[PDB]
Copies of this chain bind each other. A is one copy, B any other.
Amino acid sequence: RMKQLEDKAEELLSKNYHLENEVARLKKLV
């Protein structure tokens, strides 16, 4: 369960970063 939550945090961080990049991309388009 330790490693599973650890994998989850890392996954969510990756997703977070992708969304930040999307925001930056969309802001550039504006």
Contacts and interface: CB of A to CB of B under 8 A. Distances in A.
Number of copies: 2
Nearest to A4: B5
Chain A interface secondary structure, helix, strand, loop or mixed?
helix
Interface string A1-30: 110011011001101100110110011011
Contacts of A8: 5, 9
Contacts of A9: 5, 8-9, 12
A23 B29 contact: no
Nearest to A18: B19
Nearest first, the 6 A-B pairs at minimum CB distance are: A19-B19, A26-B26, A12-B12, A5-B5, A29-B30, A8-B9
Given A2-B5, A26-B26, A29-B30, 20 more contacts: A1-B2, A2-B2, A5-B5, A5-B9, A9-B9, A9-B12, A12-B12, A12-B13, A12-B15, A12-B16, A15-B16, A16-B16, A19-B20, A19-B22, A19-B23, A22-B23, A23-B23, A26-B27, A26-B29, A26-B30
